Amino acid sequence: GGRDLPSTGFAWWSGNARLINLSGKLLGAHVAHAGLIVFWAGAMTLFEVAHFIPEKPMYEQGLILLPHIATLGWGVGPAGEVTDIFPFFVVGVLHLISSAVLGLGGIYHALRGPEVLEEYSSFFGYDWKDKNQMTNIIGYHLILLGCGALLLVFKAMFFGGVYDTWAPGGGDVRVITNPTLNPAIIFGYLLKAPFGGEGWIISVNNMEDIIGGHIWIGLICISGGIWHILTKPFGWARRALIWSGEAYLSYSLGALSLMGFIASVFVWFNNTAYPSEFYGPTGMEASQSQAFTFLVRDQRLGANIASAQGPTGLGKYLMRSPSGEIIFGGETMRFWDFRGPWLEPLRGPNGLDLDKLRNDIQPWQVRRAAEYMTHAPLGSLNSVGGVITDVNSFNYVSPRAWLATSHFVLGFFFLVGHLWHAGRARAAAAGFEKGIDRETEPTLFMPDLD
Amino acid sequence: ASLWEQFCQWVTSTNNRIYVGWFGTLMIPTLLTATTCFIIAFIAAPPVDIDGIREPVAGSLLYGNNIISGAVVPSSNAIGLHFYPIWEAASLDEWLYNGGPYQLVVFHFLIGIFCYMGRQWELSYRLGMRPWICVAYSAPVSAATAVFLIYPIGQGSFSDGMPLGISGTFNFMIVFQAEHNILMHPFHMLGVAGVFGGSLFSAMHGSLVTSSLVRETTEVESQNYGYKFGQEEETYNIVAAHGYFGRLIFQYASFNNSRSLHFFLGAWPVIGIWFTAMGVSTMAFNLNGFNFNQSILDSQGRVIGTWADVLNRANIGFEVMHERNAHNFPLDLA
Amino acid sequence: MQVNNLGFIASILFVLVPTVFLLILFIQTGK
């Protein structure tokens, strides 16, 4: 294929578009880029390990990868205390070396390997219009994805377990012996409203549900992989979809935008797959923690926190949710759907329980609430912690803030890319992506509007 | 041929005075619903307890507001992020008191504007155009989504969505600055560059085209009549415009390719607005503007003020007064 | 509300007079 504008029709700034029909070069680009991803995983892990002070919390040190490893149950014990630093190092080293291998392969295919693969092999050669081959590649990758989900399941069940922040006796790494395979729970998660108090799938709150849903995901992905290997797209799919490389790219871009938004919300709200031990409190958690901290302090001072009415007439410390549940008062009324391992022991069937509040509060809960209140996910861009009017002496931005902001931004720009490529794929399939033909300008053959 | 096929040809018809299309089949109902509810509420909605402290705020004209002060008030802080449709209220009066109209209008409006963007793509496809006008429109859509949905989601309440009113908009902005220092956020600076530069480039482009108009009229009639709709020839001399501009600054800073020029005109404000929309969307997660409070110390250790410290003083002044009865505890975390 | 007692006359004329100016000019156009 050509490597300039005259021979390709694409400028340098759209040079990767020149690869659309060079399957070998495209494969090289993909493999090298995968090498970039794995390289970042390894290098960032080693950086985080090197810059890790293991007696300080992870979320106080700007770490986003080490929490992922800790959640999987590696190198941590009860309450998230880092037992062994070596497994983090091993994850990083393995990713770095494998990235070397992937980069070598991507360079080979991009620079010297065969330009196209179709006259080399039918198995690896593909045509974008070859619907059966495209569904074959879908099938292979679906099988792989289901296998990866089952790898998560195997780690949680047979290889030491995963970190369970809801464990009795304290959050700890525990082995999940009874995943919920019950499809009612698993698929009723997908039907929950994406609004406050329901939290469509962000509300999954126990590792049994997570592991069981991953068993279901693995089975679904593998069976769909086989289904796509053994069939071709049906008539309705053929009549509804654009069948081109750019169209498939646009479809994947839409999917990725959806996943990016979901991940940003997930890290912002969920404290089960993102234990606060490693990611710090959620904003909801920190607000509730402040309310709890001052309930505890004022109660020790002698305030009768059940009957103390605030300035507006609502309870200063306790109040009712619009459905009647007893909740913390103040602005944190909006966060009454929050559930956390440190707060549920004080919750009764009706909400917060006066008897537990008056005699069941443990010193570790007070310490945890103070920590979470002071590590609220508020911070400046230059990493000054606290409310924006605070002064420069607290260097902290929550990992939840970093992850949520970054992935909302990436989700948005991938929605933009999906719009761009979907529109372009449609126009190119219909053949007017290069502009209006003067001879057959469609609007010239149309009746005037009025 | 078939009834469904006939309906399809009608909806996707390019001969309709207003294109409907499949995105239009969602846009029209949702936008009409939002408009009717907005007008009704703006005129006649009763006061809304936005802060969830039984402190209702009058937003409608009939309850003492003018056009500037009137608004559709965001739903109650007690609701938070809960879905509050009409059928979850004990009565219409309860729904009104808790700010249900805001949720109805906002949700329908958001669906409508996303469908408007899809409809722009659809009509471009039906007319044989290039497909990317909707990409430009995605910038205002991103900004509106940031202020009506994303920011309330990150903050955890639709009470922290932008009110549907003029003064409500100003209140939103002032509180936002107090809590996030949006002025000192580089994405908002990029938004300001986007709009200032977009207006600048609009003024230059319009003035350079108007300046280089080919003489086709007399001094009496409007020069606008020198252009005939659908004429093939060019109505201005782009070469003269390039000569003027390349001598105003220097030759190589002036576009002589109209296509590159118009791409630049499209791209600058759109990119700026994308950046500012992302700025609001990320300040939704309290990743705030720069904090240089007490960044400059003298040798002894006393703080030397900068303009950032004066700005922080203004922010604190806004911060301590806003929602004066809503806070019970020392830190404004919610 | 105790509003300015000249508000109604001011607003109505503010709209009305330019409105009739435009109406006159438009309707006579083509004479």
Partner: peptide
């Protein structure tokens, strides 16, 4: 009664919109 004035001006703007769309001067190619 200033509500009447506000409603009046808003309705004037909306009526202008409907007439400007429905009864616009048709663009004609000539």
């Amino acid at each position: 009664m200033e509500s009447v004035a506000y409603i009046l001006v808003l309705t004037m703007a909306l009526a202008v919109l409907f007439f400007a769309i429905a009864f616009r001067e048709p663009p004609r190619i000539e």
